[PDB]
Design an enzyme around this catalytic site. Structure first.
Site, short mmCIF file in Angstrom:
data_model
loop_
_atom_site.label_atom_id
_atom_site.label_comp_id
_atom_site.label_asym_id
_atom_site.label_seq_id
_atom_site.Cartn_x
_atom_site.Cartn_y
_atom_site.Cartn_z
CG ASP C 349 -1.82 1.10 1.38
OD1 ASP C 349 -2.67 1.39 0.35
OD2 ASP C 349 -1.66 1.92 2.27
CE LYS C 460 -7.13 26.78 0.62
NZ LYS C 460 -6.14 27.38 1.57
CG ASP C 690 -2.31 2.50 4.98
OD1 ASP C 690 -2.50 1.75 4.00
OD2 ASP C 690 -2.68 3.69 4.99
CG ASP C 694 -4.21 -1.82 2.57
OD1 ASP C 694 -4.66 -1.62 1.42
OD2 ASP C 694 -3.40 -1.05 3.12
MG LIG Z 1 -2.63 3.59 2.84
#
Ligand SMILES: [Mg+2]
Ligand SMILES: C[C@H]1O[C@@H](O[C@H]2[C@@H](O)C[C@H](O[C@H]3[C@@H](O)C[C@H](O[C@H]4CC[C@@]5(C)[C@H](CC[C@@H]6[C@@H]5C[C@@H](O)[C@]5(C)[C@@H](C7=CC(=O)OC7)CC[C@]65O)C4)O[C@@H]3C)O[C@@H]2C)C[C@H](O)[C@@H]1O
Ligand SMILES: *[C@@H]1O[C@H](CO)[C@@H](O[C@@H]2O[C@H](CO)[C@@H](O)[C@H](O)[C@H]2NC(C)=O)[C@H](O)[C@H]1NC(C)=O
Ligand SMILES: CC(C)CCC[C@@H](C)[C@H]1CC[C@H]2[C@@H]3CC=C4C[C@@H](O)CC[C@]4(C)[C@H]3CC[C@]12C
Ligand SMILES: CC(C)CCC[C@@H](C)[C@H]1CC[C@H]2[C@@H]3CC=C4C[C@@H](O)CC[C@]4(C)[C@H]3CC[C@]12C
Ligand SMILES: OC[C@H]1O[C@@](CO)(O[C@H]2O[C@H](CO)[C@@H](O)[C@H](O)[C@H]2O)[C@@H](O)[C@@H]1O
Ligand SMILES: OC[C@H]1O[C@@](CO)(O[C@H]2O[C@H](CO)[C@@H](O)[C@H](O)[C@H]2O)[C@@H](O)[C@@H]1O
Ligand SMILES: *[C@@H]1O[C@H](CO)[C@@H](O)[C@H](O)[C@H]1NC(C)=O
Ligand SMILES: [Mg+2]
Ligand SMILES: [Mg+2]
Lengths: 290, 32, 996
Positions: C349, C460, C690, C694
């Site tokens: 990941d 902005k 993480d 996953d």
């Molecule tokens: Mg991740």
């Protein structure tokens, strides 16, 4: 696939191309292993004496044995049925088949010793410098009423039980009987110097069921082994060597009850083990049922 | 008599050996 | 019909998200401003279920102890024990010795199974405990709106279709459809994998509900701003709930090591039943009745079973796992310690795994030059040159204009990992200035802020004005930050090396192309500008408010750009380098946006420099992207939109024909599909992750790997391994460790398996040539479980015989743990020499005691007879039962001792598979101690008082000890010249037939 690999082009199951190589390798290999083994075993066989064994310390307290070695120390038989005692009788027959007078003919290899127990016969040393040693004769007449020649028993205890006790053969063993100073050896003769004594009892040291009358047959009438047959010189120096035998007859017993009997041989050269019941001593259970 | 062996002495030797070998092994696995 | 359920769970989702708010409320039956009625709320709350996920369906009881008691190997020991008990039961046909023999053996087998099971169970239990210590669930009460009134209630009491308000810092209670928003940035990082905070608005943006801005998601925290929405999904029906339930419902699959052990068992039992059957036939062919023949069959088969190998293997794995734990690498399952070593593909990941998932300053623009900052977590990188005054001005600008301030309890913490209250960019900038330029505390309170303009809804731009700290010029200082193009619109003067200038199109477009270059790098860029004020026109007492134009918002002085991105973790790039070096294919799988994904990929070395994607080729050659031949592209960035329309053959092709691969914008289900796709190639796949996206991947992988802290809970539960320190480099260590422990295992195995030839053969030729039994049961046990244990364990401490990280990953089909060559050594060669040594000692002892070997044949019949007390040796002497038996048992002890003696040599040669012992060497201390303790133990068992009474083992007449010696020396020399020839001739016949 995965597995059907038994045969295809071209391998014999499993893989058969090089099979000759590996088979040859294992023939050579296992051949050399065998050779090496036989080598070690050969030097080992070079280091053993042809006359005396290299270690005698395991047999040191020789044992007492019976003729009709039973399934477990037990003779249980009917005084009537001929087939009842047949096994025991045959065992005895073949046992003493070696001891008959026509079995020792030769004055070449046989020697006539005393008709009375005598001092040990020492023959040279244990090497081959001297020729094959003579062997002292043992005539079955020394045991009366038990296998004495033709006349009687012959039912071999058929009326009342009898068993011959034998001392285990040990090369070089020279039995030393207990001293004339002997501690409470129970009824026994005065022939203690040249004989190795044996006596029987119902139970060892404790309360007994005791029922018995025992008549002993030794050499010259003494309940023991004559020292003249010792030392034993081994199967090589003395083939056809006949060791002493001694008969014990139980005349008076209670028939239909089983009782036990222990026969102890006494001496300084003699010893007993509690784990080995046949070491130095003897055990037999006998039931004659009718 | 040939019928006597010194088993107790050999026994002692083997045991002494076992002790030494083991404690030496212990010295070996502890390298500080 | 759960197959269909999981089939619907592997499919990507759908929604109602695109509706007129009129139609939305028309469908859901709710007021947009007032929410719905309390009665209705409580009606729905009890209608289906409270808002929360069903607790993990798995709650196995401590009865799971039983799991450890079976497996495949413990099974082998089980059937062994059962066969033993059956044998004794058959020996109940008579009055029988096994009271000390067969019953003993079976019970011992059972004991080994149970004990080892207990140990392994305790280990896994311990890991589970230390994992339990890590779970902290804080109730977060949702803010609802019902009957027009705002009410803060327990989040579990939230229902479908009622108005919810989320604020800065608030976690999203359930899946919402945003009706209204102000400046609202939610953090989707864990769920969809989007790195930077995504803004949320009422308006419909993207067809895919995951990337659209009008939906807010469960378990996601709102970074900033505020929003109102109607609840579309509650509880398990939510997105991450579906993901979680998919994760819980997947299959672990068989670990590689377990398979290798299964195969090993097949070998062992193979030769077991071959010997058993062939010798059953053989036994019947001679005399022995079906009774005896059966007893012999059971005897041999059971004899072939390695009791102690269970213990030694379990302990081996446990040791390696111990080191793993020492490095803060925890393994949930015991056999998962190996898997990395067998892995040919790593799916990783991006955010939170490969990267830090923390917005951080990357590059800065000073004097028309790009200076890269230190992006590492530990500050292990290179600091820029801060001597220039331009950097000073810039740093003061960034530090002074912010809403960012450190919170109360962050002092002792490192400046990076410490918490900050503010925006993403503002956090990054704050940390950066606090780091490089010193403290922003006295620095921000040095200049006193008068009136500030917070980021406007349009354009902005954010400006503020402060007084002058300097002793020279008492001018008012004005500072502003904002998007590069708008600030370019509002700026004129440029600053260089401490002195100003106007803008010329040369360096203006140098700024433009620098901005487009840094922007193309994946980073987010912010324009920083300041202006002094004409204090003559704006005096020291002048109070300027936000109404009209107080300051000249044009003709300002543009300073530079500061760009920021979430960087890879410090240890990551080197790690990926090593994994590639070991021959492991690294694939990036992320749900993030392609533009950033490719950049990070090139950064961490998944896509190497110079390797071109199809699109890179298309761009360079100024050609339609469809023209170029995909074979010419080694690397590819695969868009998730396409991945939905892709087939099996297509994915197979993508994985086959591209070396460096990045899947971007990929749903969790698609991560699962990618993992399964790499598994369709028949390759071992490891997954590192993480967030919750996953969860299905990490579960499906041969081995999953989570992040101990930056990882979420579901994916942590799904993982087979956890990194507590969150160090990616550990993965490398892993694939090293697992690749080493493989080799050592072989050695250990080999060693034990060598012992079974000299163990079984005595009972074999006992049946064949009818000699007295050379080796007893107790002795055999004193070898298997008594002595060989410490050496067999010590073999685990063997080191790498070469560089292992050099060699390619093993092939599961070809390279085996226990294969033909091992058996051909242990059983075929070495064990044979051992057996010969044993029988040699046997004959030495028996010949010296008066029984010559040639005379020993056929003797057993009378020998084992208890009641024959006149037994003739070769010298004519007569032995009783207990005497000659004492000799047989004092023939057992030296056979055992001899086994130890040959196991010396076997231990030293098993130490090395290839290297000669004079190379690798005796540097193993545990091995030395193994030898010492082994020998000492044997000597003890032999000579300890009462051992002949207890174990029926007798003191060795000492010269007995030297009978085995030449055979040991032979073993050593032989295997040494074998491991010589193998080294010299790596063709090779010796290498093909023997090396294992
Ligand atoms: Mg991740
Ligand atoms: C009517 C006549 O019947 C007449 O009965 C006979 C018949 O029933 C025939 C009957 O054969 C025996 C004989 O062959 C001796 C024979 O004795 C051997 C077989 C059984 C053993 C207990 C024993 C000691 C080693 C032991 C085996 C059994 C195996 O399972 C082991 C546990 C195995 C191990 C597995 C492992 O992992 O470690 C080692 C390999 C070696 C082992 O340790 C040797 O066991 C066989 C069963 O012996 C009886 C006495 C009696 C009178 O003659 C009567 O007049
Ligand atoms: C062995 O048995 C015979 C019996 O055949 C004994 O001879 C008997 O001896 C008793 C005295 O004990 C006499 O009263 C009988 O008249 C004898 N009968 C016969 C037929 O001889 C013989 O004395 C016994 N000898 C020994 C040594 O026990
Ligand atoms: C050194 C090698 C390669 C060559 C061959 C020498 C072998 C055959 C030698 C070396 C050690 C020797 C043995 C050492 C132990 C003794 C025990 C003793 O009670 C009888 C002989 C015996 C068993 C020896 C016989 C021969 C022996 C096994
Ligand atoms: C490098 C090689 C030689 C390693 C082997 C060590 C040998 C030589 C050691 C290991 C076990 C030892 C024995 C252990 C038992 C004792 C009993 C003692 O009463 C006499 C010696 C004796 C028999 C030892 C002699 C030396 C011995 C045989
Ligand atoms: O042969 C193994 C044995 O060798 C030792 C000491 O003899 O180390 C030798 O070999 C090493 C090669 O790695 C070198 O240190 C050097 O050649 C020599 O010391 C021991 O480490 C080991 O027991
Ligand atoms: O190798 C000679 C060495 O062994 C000893 C015991 O230490 O041998 C004794 O025990 C042996 C057991 O087999 C006997 O063979 C040997 O006769 C007996 O002396 C010592 O002799 C010697 O130190
Ligand atoms: C033999 O035993 C019987 C009974 O046991 C006994 O009556 C008889 O007197 C014994 N014979 C003797 C003592 O001579
Ligand atoms: Mg798993
Ligand atoms: Mg074994």
């Amino acid at each position: 696939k995965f597995i059907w690999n038994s045969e295809k082009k071209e391998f014999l199951g499993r893989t058969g191309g090089s099979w000759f190589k590996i088979l040859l390798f294992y023939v050579i290999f296992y051949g050399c292993l065998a050779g090496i083994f036989i080598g070690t075993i050969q030097v080992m066989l070079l280091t053993i004496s042809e006359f005396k064994p290299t270690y005698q310390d395991r047999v040191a307290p020789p044992g007492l044995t019976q003729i009709p070695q039973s399934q477990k120390t037990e003779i249980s038989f009917r005084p009537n049925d001929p087939q009842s005692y047949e096994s025991y009788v045959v065992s005895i027959v073949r046992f003493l088949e070696k001891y008959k007078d026509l079995a020792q003919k030769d004055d070449m290899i046989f020697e006539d010793c005393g008709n009375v127990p005598s001092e040990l016969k020492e023959r040279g040393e244990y090497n081959n410098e001297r020729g094959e040693r003579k062997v002292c004769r043992f005539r079955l007449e020394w045991l009366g009423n038990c296998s004495g020649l033709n006349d009687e028993t012959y039912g071999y205890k058929d009326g009342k039980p009898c068993v011959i006790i034998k001392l285990n053969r040990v090369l070089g063993f020279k039995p030393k009987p207990p001293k004339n100073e002997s501690l409470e050896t129970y009824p026994v003769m005065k022939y203690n110097p040249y004989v190795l004594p044996v006596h029987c009892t119902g139970k060892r040291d404790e309360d007994k069921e005791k029922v018995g009358t025992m008549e002993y047959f030794g050499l010259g009438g003494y309940p023991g082994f004559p020292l003249q047959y010792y030392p034993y010189y081994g199967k090589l120096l003395q083939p056809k060597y006949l060791q002493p035998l001694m008969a014990v007859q139980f005349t008076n017993l209670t028939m239909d009850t089983e009782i036990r009997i222990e026969c102890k041989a006494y001496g300084e050269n003699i010893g007993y083990s509690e784990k080995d019941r046949f070491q130095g001593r003897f055990d037999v259970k006998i039931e004659v049922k009718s | 008599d040939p019928f006597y062996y010194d088993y107790e002495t050999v026994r002692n030797g083997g045991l002494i050996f076992a002790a030494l070998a083991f404690i030496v092994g212990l010295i070996i696995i502890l390298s500080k | 019909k759960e197959r269909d359920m999981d089939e619907l769970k592997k499919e990507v989702s759908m929604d109602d998200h695109k509706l007129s708010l009129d139609e939305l409320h028309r469908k859901y039956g709710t007021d947009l401003s007032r929410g719905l009625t309390p009665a209705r709320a409580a009606e729905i709350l009890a209608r289906d279920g409270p808002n929360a996920l069903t607790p993990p369906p798995t709650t196995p009881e401590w009865v799971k102890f039983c799991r450890q008691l079976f497996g495949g190997f413990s099974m082998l020991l089980w059937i062994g024990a059962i066969l033993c008990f059956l044998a004794y039961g058959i020996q109940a046909a008579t009055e029988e010795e096994p009271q000390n023999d067969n019953l003993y053996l079976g019970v011992v087998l059972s004991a080994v199974v149970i004990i080892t099971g207990c140990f392994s169970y305790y280990q896994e239990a311990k890991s589970s405990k230390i994992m339990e210590s890590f779970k902290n669930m804080v109730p977060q009460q949702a803010l609802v709106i019902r009957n027009g009134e705002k009410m803060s209630i327990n989040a579990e009491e939230v229902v479908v279709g009622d108005l919810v308000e989320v604020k800065g810092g608030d976690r999203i209670p359930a899946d919402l459809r945003i009706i209204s928003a102000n400046g609202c940035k939610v953090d989707n990082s864990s769920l969809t994998g989007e790195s930077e905070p995504q803004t949320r608005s009422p308006d419909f943006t993207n067809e895919n509900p995951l990337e659209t801005r009008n939906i807010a998601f469960f378990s996601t925290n709102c970074v900033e701003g505020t929003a109102r929405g109607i609840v579309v999904y509650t509880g398990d029906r939510t997105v991450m709930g579906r993901i979680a339930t998919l994760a819980s419902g997947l299959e672990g699959g068989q670990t590689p090591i377990a398979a290798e052990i299964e195969h090993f068992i097949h070998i062992i039992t193979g030769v077991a039943v071959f010997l058993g059957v062939s010798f059953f036939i053989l036994s019947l062919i001679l005399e022995y009745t079906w009774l005896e023949a059966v007893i012999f069959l059971i005897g041999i088969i059971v004899a072939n079973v390695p009791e102690g190998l269970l213990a030694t293997v379990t302990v081996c794995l446990t040791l390696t796992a111990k080191r793993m734990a020492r490095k803060n690498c925890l393994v949930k399952n015991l056999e998962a310690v190996e898997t990395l070593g067998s892995t040919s593909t790593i799916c990783s990941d991006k955010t939170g795994t490969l990267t830090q998932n923390r917005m951080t300053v990357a590059h800065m623009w000073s004097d028309n030059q790009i200076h890269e900052a230190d992006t590492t977590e530990n500050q292990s990188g290179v600091s820029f040159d801060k001597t220039s005054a331009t950097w000073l001005a810039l740093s003061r600008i960034a530090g002074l204009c912010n809403r960012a301030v450190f919170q109360a309890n962050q002092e002792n913490l490192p400046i990076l990992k410490r918490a900050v209250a503010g925006d993403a960019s503002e956090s990054a900038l704050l940390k950066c200035i606090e780091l490089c330029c010193g403290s922003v505390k006295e620095m921000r309170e040095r200049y006193t802020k008068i009136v500030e303009i917070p980021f406007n809804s349009t354009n902005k731009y954010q400006l503020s004005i402060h007084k002058n700290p300097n002793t020279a010029e008492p001018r008012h200082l004005l500072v502003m930050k904002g998007a590069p193009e708008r600030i370019l619109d509002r700026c004129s003067s440029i600053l260089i090396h401490g002195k100003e200038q106007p803008l010329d199109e040369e360096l203006k477009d140098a700024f433009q192309n620098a901005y487009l270059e840094l922007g193309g790098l994946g980073e987010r860029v912010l324009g920083f500008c300041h202006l002094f004020l004409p204090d003559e026109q704006f005096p020291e007492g002048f109070q300027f408010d936000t109404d009209d134009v107080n300051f000249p918002l044009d003709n300002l002085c543009f300073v530079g750009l500061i760009s920021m991105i979430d960087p890879p973790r410090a240890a990551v790039p080197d790690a990926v380098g090593k994994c590639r070096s070991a021959g492991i294919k690294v694939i990036m799988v992320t749900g993030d946006h392609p533009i950033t994904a490719k950049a990070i990929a090139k950064g961490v070395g998944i896509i190497s420099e110079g390797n071109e994607t199809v699109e890179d080729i298309a761009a360079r050659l100024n050609i339609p992207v469809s023209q170029v031949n995909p074979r010419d592209a080694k690397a590819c960035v695969v868009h998730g939109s396409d991945l939905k329309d892709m087939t099996s053959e297509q994915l197979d092709d993508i994985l086959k024909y591209h070396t460096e691969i990045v899947f971007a914008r990929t749903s969790p289900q698609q991560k699962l599909i990618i993992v399964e796709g790499c598994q369709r190639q028949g390759a071992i796949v490891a997954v590192t992750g993480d967030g919750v996206n996953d969860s299905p991947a990490s579960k499906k992988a041969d081995i999953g790997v989570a992040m101990g802290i930056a990882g979420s809970d579901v994916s942590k539960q799904a993982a087979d391994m956890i990194l507590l320190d969150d160090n990616f480099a550990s993965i490398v260590t892993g694939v090293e460790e697992g690749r080493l422990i493989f080799d050592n295992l072989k050695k250990s195995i080999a060693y034990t398996l060598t012992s079974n030839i000299p163990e079984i053969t005595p009972f074999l030729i006992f049946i064949i040539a009818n000699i007295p039994l050379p080796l007893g049961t107790v002795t055999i046990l004193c070898i298997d479980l008594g002595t060989d244990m410490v050496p067999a364990i010590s073999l685990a401490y063997e080191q790498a015989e070469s560089d292992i990280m050099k060699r390619q990953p093993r092939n599961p089909k070809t390279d085996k743990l226990v294969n033909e060559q091992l058996i051909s050594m242990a059983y075929g060669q070495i064990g044979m020499i051992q057996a010969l040594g044993g029988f040699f000692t046997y004959f030495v002892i028996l010949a010296e005691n008066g029984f010559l070997p040639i005379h020993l044949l056929g003797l057993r019949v009378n020998w084992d007879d208890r009641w024959i007390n006149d037994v003739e040796d070769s010298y004519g002497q007569q032995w009783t039962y207990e005497q000659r038996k004492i000799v047989e048992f004092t023939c057992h002890t030296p056979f055992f001792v001899t086994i130890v003696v040959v196991q010396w040599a076997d231990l030293v040669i098993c130490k090395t598979r290839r290297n000669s012992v004079f190379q690798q060497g005796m540097k193993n201390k545990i091995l030395i101690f193994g030898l010492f303790e082994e020998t000492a133990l044997a000597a003890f068992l032999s000579y300890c008082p009462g051992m002949g009474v207890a174990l029926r083992m007798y003191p060795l007449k000492p010269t007995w000890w030297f009978c085995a010696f030449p055979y040991s020396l032979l073993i050593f020399v032989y295997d040494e010249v074998r491991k010589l020839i193998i080294r010299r001739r790596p063709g090779g016949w010796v290498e093909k037939e023997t090396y294992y």
